[PDB]
Every structure is written in structure tokens, then in C-alpha cells.
From Swiss-Prot:
GO terms for molecular function: UFM1 conjugating enzyme activity; UFM1 transferase activity. Ufmylated at Lys-123. Deufmylated by UFSP1. Signal peptide: none annotated. Interacts with UBA5 (via C-terminus). Interacts with UFL1. Interacts with UFM1. Interacts with KIRREL3. GO terms for biological process: brain development; protein K69-linked ufmylation; protein ufmylation; regulation of type II interferon production; response to endoplasmic reticulum stress; reticulophagy. The keyword Ubl conjugation applies. Changing Q31A: Does not affect neither UBA5-binding nor thioester formation with UFM1. This is Ubiquitin-fold modifier-conjugating enzyme 1. In absence of UBA5, the active site is solvated by water molecules thereby reducing its nucleophilic activity. A linker region of UBA5 is required to reduce the amount of water molecules in the vicinity of the active site and elevate its nucleophilic activity. Belongs to the ubiquitin-conjugating enzyme family. UFC1 subfamily.
Length: 162
């Protein structure tokens, strides 16, 4: 299967997650947060090594609100966008909805408030992999490919500028 090989090529060096726990799940949530941070930091480390260091994230104390920045390079110009998301109560079976608030209303493949609209294939890919995928996988398989289509289109239309 091309889809299965494409997934593996993107995520094979991201630590797999284990714990089925969302924000309300106490010691099991603290455990899932350990898996989340090790998976993210290994992903960042791999990104730096491949000259593709494209985002920073932090969470609140409880790990229920995430925010940071992504950088998208086009014709050697680096574009910075603020990102944020809440962890759904039913995480990790339900995927979080990444918002890029400054692009709110400017992209067709987006909901009111700047929540990105991921392709019909991302959600069943997430669903098939529960609970192995985490925030690192959301960034690699969700936001990363959305930027690689939407940012170049916004620049060409002159909707955003350096």
C-alpha cells in the first residue's frame, strides 16, 4: 500500500506513543504527556539534523493547551506563523484541531477561527493508528503537508507578505 509506505517514510524515526489517556486521566495523562514530550523532542532533534527545524511548541502546566510557532521557507524566505490547540477530552482517539489564527478567513481548507481543515485521509490514518500517533505525528502528517500546499498559494496570491 502506497499510503502505508508514505506514512512509514514520514514517521518511522518518531517514537511511537502507547498510553490511552486524555486531559482528565490523572496519573495516566502525566504518563501520556511523557510519551508526547519525548516523541516531540526526538522529532525536533531529527528536524534540526535534516536542516528542517520548522516549529517550536510548549504546553501549559496541565498539558491541555499547546502553542508555539512554525516557520515555512519559500524561495529562501522564512515565514513565521503562531499556532495553538486544545487537547480534546477524548484525546488520543480524537485528533486535536490546530489553529493558525492569523490566517483565519484567508484559506478555503480552514474553519472559522483559523482551525486547519485536514484532508479526508489524515483522520482515518490517525484513527487506524490510535493510540500510537501523538502531537509529533499531528505536526508531521497534519500541519506540515497543509503548510506545503497552503503557504505557497497564499504567497502567490499576495494574501501574505515577508
Amino acid at each position: 500500500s502506497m499510503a502505508d509506505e508514505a506514512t512509514r517514510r514520514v514517521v518511522s524515526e518518531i517514537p511511537v506513543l502507547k498510553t490511552n489517556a486524555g486531559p482528565r486521566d490523572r496519573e495516566l495523562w502525566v504518563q501520556r504527556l511523557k510519551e508526547e514530550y519525548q516523541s516531540l523532542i526526538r522529532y525536533v532533534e531529527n528536524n534540526k539534523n535534516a536542516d528542517n527545524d520548522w516549529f517550536r511548541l510548549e504546553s501549559n502546566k496541565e498539558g491541555t493547551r499547546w502553542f508555539g510557532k512554525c516557520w515555512y521557507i519559500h524561495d529562501l524566505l522564512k515565514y513565521e506563523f503562531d499556532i495553538e490547540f486544545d487537547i480534546p477530552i477524548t484525546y488520543p482517539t480524537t485528533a486535536p484541531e490546530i489553529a493558525v489564527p492569523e490566517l483565519d478567513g484567508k484559506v478555503a481548507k480552514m474553519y472559522r477561527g483559523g482551525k486547519i481543515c485536514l484532508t479526508d485521509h489524515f483522520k482515518p490514518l490517525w484513527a487506524r493508528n490510535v493510540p500510537k500517533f501523538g502531537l509529533a505525528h499531528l505536526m508531521a502528517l497534519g500541519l506540515g503537508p497543509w503548510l506545503a500546499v497552503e503557504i505557497p498559494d497564499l504567497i502567490q496570491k499576495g494574501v501574505i507578505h515577508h
